């Protein structure tokens, strides 16, 4: 293990040498700026923060260093900063100054290559690896004028929806320090969660711009999966297609997703990734105000929702219908089938084994709970598990039963499959005429190192990447004591122990915000966002 060792002792010089520089930047800017209303300038709505830097009124050092202030001040408390991209400092000199993002700020997942800068993903063997140079989304954040200003942290290996690796260790939740911040997207939950970053980008193939919005209280979108480009993600495995990743972004209101997406959907995306479709942002659709038919449900008859998840789910319902929305019962057929048969076969078609040599001579993190183990078994072994646990414990045996490896031939039929299950959702989706589709989100924040073993929670987010559905999150509530007490009638629809470990799980959450899903067909990232922006304006005023 001596290898893995000192691959973490030296990404947290690392991290501690890049903190020291964080601090010493911003003390410097302090005592040149003594007068700098800094509460009013972090307090202030990105557009506004946007309108403010595009007319001269507040300079990109001003917002810069206060910002880098508040994310230096938030990372004692939440340890989401695993390293300061240097280079930003000149960015912001030569930030082209008619740019639609122009002096804003933007946090980075660590994935999110950047020159000269590792994307360890908490893995070993990643370490001391830099990247030779940025990736396209983040070129197209500079061409806009954009700062990128630090990597955020994620779980090991990206595949936990808990936030912690063997070489930063563990993010924290800012709002109760025992809670998870989601994940894998956790650093920036937490980060933007907490004030010190007003815009950032994660990415999601089974829910991790979600959940971390989810769990810290602020808004994310995944798109459509080839919306955005993938070029230059560090990633654990590649060349899987069946289930897609999506990169997206996180921010404190639905606005901000939108004025993002906007400046990515840029001619210079377009000629960077001509392999990306140019479709331009459809601004018209994203600012429509046109009654909508909103599918619903209350429950994926999968994962049991806490109160305070229907209580979210029920009130937006609500509040829907009495501003003239037609509210439509509406669940997705054979989500079971789409949960553990394609989606899990999708993800491990392989029985996990490319996942598993990046472990090779590695620590497994906790929070991954026993994934490791469990797909390192061998294929007869799954299989004869999965017969035994059938009549007791379904839902445990299917999952181990689909992700054994297979043939090229079956990854086919399996790919065929996944096709016309998405066929077979839209055409549902058309013959009640839906325009979009409301769901549960998962929450509040489950414990940490829960999410690694409450691994059927998932279902609520993983439907819509198997679909590859726009999918949004707006958070519109907070746990009340009555939700939190209510909890103790918790049963699950199963009594596996994936239900158990939920349940204990989500209790001790008072005063934890809770979110509902927004989702569109295939690229109608406009009309999702225009369903979140109406959530958010009934929701949360
Ligand atoms: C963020 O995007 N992610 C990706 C998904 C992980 C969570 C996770 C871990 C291990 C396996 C799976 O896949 C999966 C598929 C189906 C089911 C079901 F059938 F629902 F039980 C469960 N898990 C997902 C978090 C970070
Ligand atoms: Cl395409």
Redesign the pocket.
């Given at each position: 293990r001596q290898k893995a060792r000192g691959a973490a002792t030296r990404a947290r010089q690392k991290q501690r040498a890049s903190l020291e520089t964080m601090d010493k930047a911003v003390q410097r800017f302090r005592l040149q700026n003594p007068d700098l209303d800094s509460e009013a300038l972090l307090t202030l709505p990105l557009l506004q923060l946007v309108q403010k830097l595009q007319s001269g009124e507040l300079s990109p050092e001003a917002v810069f260093f206060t910002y880098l202030g508040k994310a230096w001040e938030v990372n004692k408390g939440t340890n989401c900063v695993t390293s300061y991209l240097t280079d930003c400092e000149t960015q912001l000199s030569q930030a082209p100054r008619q740019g639609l993002l122009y002096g804003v700020p933007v946090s980075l997942k660590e994935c999110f290559s950047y020159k000269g800068h590792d994307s360890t993903l908490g893995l070993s063997l990643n370490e001391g690896m830099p990247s030779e140079s940025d990736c396209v989304v983040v070129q197209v954040l500079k061409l806009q004028g954009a700062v990128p200003f630090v990597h955020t942290n994620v779980?090991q290996s990206?595949?936990?929806?808990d936030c912690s690796n063997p070489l930063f260790g563990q993010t924290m939740n800012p709002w109760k320090s025992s809670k998870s911040p989601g994940?894998?997207s956790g650093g920036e939950g937490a980060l933007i969660g907490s004030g010190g970053s007003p815009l950032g980008l994660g990415?999601?193939?089974?829910?991790?711009?979600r959940?971390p919005s989810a769990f810290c209280g602020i808004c994310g979108l995944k798109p459509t999966g080839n919306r955005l480009s993938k070029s230059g993600l560090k990633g654990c495995v590649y060349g899987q297609t069946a289930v897609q990743l999506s990169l997206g972004p996180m921010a404190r209101d639905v606005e901000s997703l939108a004025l993002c997406l906007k400046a990515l959907l840029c001619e210079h995306l377009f000629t960077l990734d001509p392999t990306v479709p140019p479709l331009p942002f459809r601004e018209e659709v994203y600012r429509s105000s046109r009654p909508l038919r909103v599918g619903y449900y209350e429950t994926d008859n999968?994962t049991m929702p806490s109160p305070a998840m229907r209580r979210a789910l029920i009130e937006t319902k609500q509040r829907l219908e009495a501003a003239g929305h037609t509210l439509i019962p509406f669940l997705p057929n054979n989500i079971?089938y789409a949960?553990?048969v394609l989606?899990?076969g999708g993800?491990?078609s392989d029985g996990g084994r490319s996942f598993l040599q990046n472990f090779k001579g590695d620590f497994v993190d906790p929070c991954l709970g026993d994934?490791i183990l469990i797909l390192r078994l061998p294929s007869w072994f799954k299989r004869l598990l999965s017969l035994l646990l059938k009549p007791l414990f379904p839902?445990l045996a299917?999952?181990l039963n689909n992700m054994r490896p297979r043939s090229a031939e079956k990854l086919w039929k399996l790919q065929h499959e996944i096709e016309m299950y998405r066929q077979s959702v839209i055409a549902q989706w058309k013959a009640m005429n839906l325009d979009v589709l409301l769901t549960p989100m998962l929450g509040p924040a489950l414990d940490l190192n829960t999410?690694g073993r409450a691994?059927?929670a998932?279902?609520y987010t993983?439907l819509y990447?198997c679909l590859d559905f726009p999918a949004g999150v707006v958070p519109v509530t907070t746990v009340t004591a009555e939700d939190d007490a209510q909890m103790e009638l918790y049963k699950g629809y199963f009594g596996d122990i994936?239900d158990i470990i939920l349940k204990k799980a989500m209790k001790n959450s008072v005063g934890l915000p809770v979110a509902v899903q927004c989702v569109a067909l295939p690229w109608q990232e406009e009309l999702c966002l225009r369903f979140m922006r109406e959530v958010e304006q009934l929701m949360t005023p």
């Open positions: 779980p990206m595949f936990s929806y994940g894998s990415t999601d193939i089974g829910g991790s711009i959940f999968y079971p949960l553990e989606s899990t993800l491990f994934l839902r299917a999952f999410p691994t059927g998932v279902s993983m990447n994936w």
